Amino acid sequence: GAMGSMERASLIQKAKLAEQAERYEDMAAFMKGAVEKGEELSCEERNLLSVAYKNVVGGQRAAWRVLSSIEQKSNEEKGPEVREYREKVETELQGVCDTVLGLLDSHLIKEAGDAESRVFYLKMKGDYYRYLAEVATGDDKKRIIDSARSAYQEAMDISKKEMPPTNPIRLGLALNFSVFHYEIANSPEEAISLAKTTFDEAMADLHTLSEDSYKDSTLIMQLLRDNLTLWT
Amino acid sequence: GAMGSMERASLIQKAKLAEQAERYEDMAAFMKGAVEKGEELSCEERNLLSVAYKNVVGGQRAAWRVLSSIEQKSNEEKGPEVREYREKVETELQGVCDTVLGLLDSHLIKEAGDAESRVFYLKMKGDYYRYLAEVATGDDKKRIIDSARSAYQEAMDISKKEMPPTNPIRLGLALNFSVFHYEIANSPEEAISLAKTTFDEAMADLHTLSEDSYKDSTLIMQLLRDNLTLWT
Amino acid sequence: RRPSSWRQ
Amino acid sequence: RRPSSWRQ
Numbered sequence: 256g257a258m259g260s261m262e263r264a265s266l267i268q269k270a271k272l273a274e275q276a277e278r279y280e281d282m283a284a285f286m287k288g289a290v291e292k293g294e295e296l297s298c299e300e301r302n303l304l305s306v307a308y309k310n311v312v313g314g315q316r317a318a319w320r321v322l323s324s325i326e327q328k329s330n331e332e333k334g335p336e337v338r339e340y341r342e343k344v345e346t347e348l349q350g351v352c353d354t355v356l357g358l359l360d361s362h363l364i365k366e367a368g369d370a371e372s373r374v375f376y377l378k379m380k381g382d383y384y385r386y387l388a389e390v391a392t393g394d395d396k397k398r399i400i401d402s403a404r405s406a407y408q409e410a411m412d413i414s415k416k417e418m419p420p421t422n423p424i425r426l427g428l429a430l431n432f433s434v435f436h437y438e439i440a441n442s443p444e445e446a447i448s449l450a451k452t453t454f455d456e457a458m459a460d461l462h463t464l465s466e467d468s469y470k471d472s473t474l475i476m477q478l479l480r481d482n483l484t485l486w487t
Numbered sequence: 488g489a490m491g492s493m494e495r496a497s498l499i500q501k502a503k504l505a506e507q508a509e510r511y512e513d514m515a516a517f518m519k520g521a522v523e524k525g526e527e528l529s530c531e532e533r534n535l536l537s538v539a540y541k542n543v544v545g546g547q548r549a550a551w552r553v554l555s556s557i558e559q560k561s562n563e564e565k566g567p568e569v570r571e572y573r574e575k576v577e578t579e580l581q582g583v584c585d586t587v588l589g590l591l592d593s594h595l596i597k598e599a600g601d602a603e604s605r606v607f608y609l610k611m612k613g614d615y616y617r618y619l620a621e622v623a624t625g626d627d628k629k630r631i632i633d634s635a636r637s638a639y640q641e642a643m644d645i646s647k648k649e650m651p652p653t654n655p656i657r658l659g660l661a662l663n664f665s666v667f668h669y670e671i672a673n674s675p676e677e678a679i680s681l682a683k684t685t686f687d688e689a690m691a692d693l694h695t696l697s698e699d700s701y702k703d704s705t706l707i708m709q710l711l712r713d714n715l716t717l718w719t
Numbered sequence: 720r721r722p723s724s725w726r727q
Numbered sequence: 728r729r730p731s732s733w734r735q
């Protein structure tokens with residue numbers, strides 16, 4: 256690996272620097288190097304990994320949607336360039352998703368013993384299979400979709416047994432699983448039911464929280480509310 | 488070159504697509520391939536080249552300034568990581584500047600016969616030597632600064648002889664040359680005098696313009712005014 | 720519009 | 728603040 260010669264702590268330090276400089280490709284490369292040191296990641300380190308790759312793939316998804324819309328308007332004969340460039344961005348996006356899924360499979364998930372870390376990595380696995388499903392059209396599209404579902408579902412089962420309803424990673428997992436139901440699985444009623452049940456059970460648990468935990472949980476509850484207002 | 492196998496028109500088409508997708512690194516690679524076809528660039532094509540690399544180097548400059556500020560605060564012993572990463576971003580920035588200057592030297596400038604294209608490319612040359620000067624600290628810093636000045640000065644001499652005072656590339660050239668005077672050459676009075684004289688002589692020529700040309704010229708005049716208000 | 724997934 | 732150079 257290109258980062259094999261740099262200290263683990265130096266990679267973490269430089270990932271935080273790249274975040275400040277809004278250099279998210281560098282940030283992702285640094286955290287990939289940190290993961291490949293073979294040690295488990297702390298809560299802070301897991302978030303750095305997540306933020307880096309979410310920003311990288313977020314720009315690729317936004318670009319893919321721009322090009323896909325142009326491509327659809329063109330097919331409503333004018334040259335192969337639009338399809339070619341959409342395919343180029345698509346292939347780069349799939350490469351990043353495959354890289355993240357490789358880090359999770361080797362060997363972040365299998366070494367995640369606590370519910371907190373295991374749910375985190377399974378939510379990541381669901382997210383990046385979902386991003387693969389957004390662009391999928393081939394023989395394996397249904398298997399990609401079910402791979403996202405299976406990872407989300409295991410994370411949901413763990414979070415319901417081991418976490419309170421206001422736990423931020425439990426809330427974020429339910430939010431993204433509901434987005435999966437609505438946008439990928441074409442199950443809007445399941446999406447709405449999950450978002451409502453998650454919001455209501457979090458609302459009833461707020462009384463147990465400090466001011467700092469209250470802020471974290473209500474932030475994600477507001478995202479659930481935003482989708483419910485969009486969907487109903 | 489990596490773009491040697493793609494048609495010139497396809498590279499232009501994909502550069503416009505990359506701009507719509509906000510994929511400015513792709514946009515710069517496409518226009519570099521277009522330039523390396525060996526034909527002169529149209530007005531529209533020159534702007535695509537400019538916009539692509541200005542966005543790429545603009546993100547590198549912003550990142551370099553973030554890291555340089557962190558580095559200065561650290562030196563007011565805590566590890567080499569900040570300097571190392573600042574050097575990494577710095578080297579990448581210099582690589583992009585060197586690439587653009589190579590396109591101008593081989594062979595955009597020498598084939599630019601009209602005043603409009605030659606001033607455009609000389610303004611580019613001044614800009615990218617200025618970006619090199621922003622990070623320069625070595626034996627050749629004064630020569631880098633004078634290389635920027637020499638390119639700006641030749642472009643200024645041509646624009647004053649061959650263009651009206653409201654010509655957008657003449658206005659933009661004077662704006663950037665004034666920024667060079669203020670920030671690089673430590674000559675604020677020369678910067679202020681140039682910006683004021685450029686604004687006033689453009690103001691007196693507005694009466695000759697159509698509504699569309701009037702909008703173009705007053706846009707750049709407003710940038711000159713913004714700097715004059717900042718500097719006085 | 721598109722729905723909201725987790726964002727930082 | 729920093730001064731304005733040409734921007735599109």
Ligand SMILES: *Cc1ccc(-n2ccnc2-c2ccc(F)cc2F)cc1Br
Nearest residue numbers: 298299301302305375423424427471725
């Ligand atoms: C997907 C996701 C949901 C919530 C959060 N989140 C919000 C506030 N803190 C956190 C967080 C940070 C680190 C961690 F290991 C778990 C966690 F919930 C972050 C993400 Br990614």
Ligand SMILES: *Cc1ccc(-n2ccnc2-c2ccc(F)cc2F)cc1Br
Nearest residue numbers: 530531533534537607655656659703733
């Ligand atoms: C550096 C610079 C200054 C002005 C402009 N500009 C503004 C409106 N049109 C243009 C333009 C576009 C293309 C061209 F070849 C010359 C030109 F002045 C663009 C730039 Br870059």
Ligand SMILES: [Ca+2]
Nearest residue numbers: 261262263264
């Ligand atoms: Ca070590």
Ligand SMILES: [Ca+2]
Nearest residue numbers: 493494495496
């Ligand atoms: Ca050809």
Ligand SMILES: [Cl-]
Nearest residue numbers: 339340343501
């Ligand atoms: Cl392509």
Ligand SMILES: [Cl-]
Nearest residue numbers: 269571572575
């Ligand atoms: Cl580095």
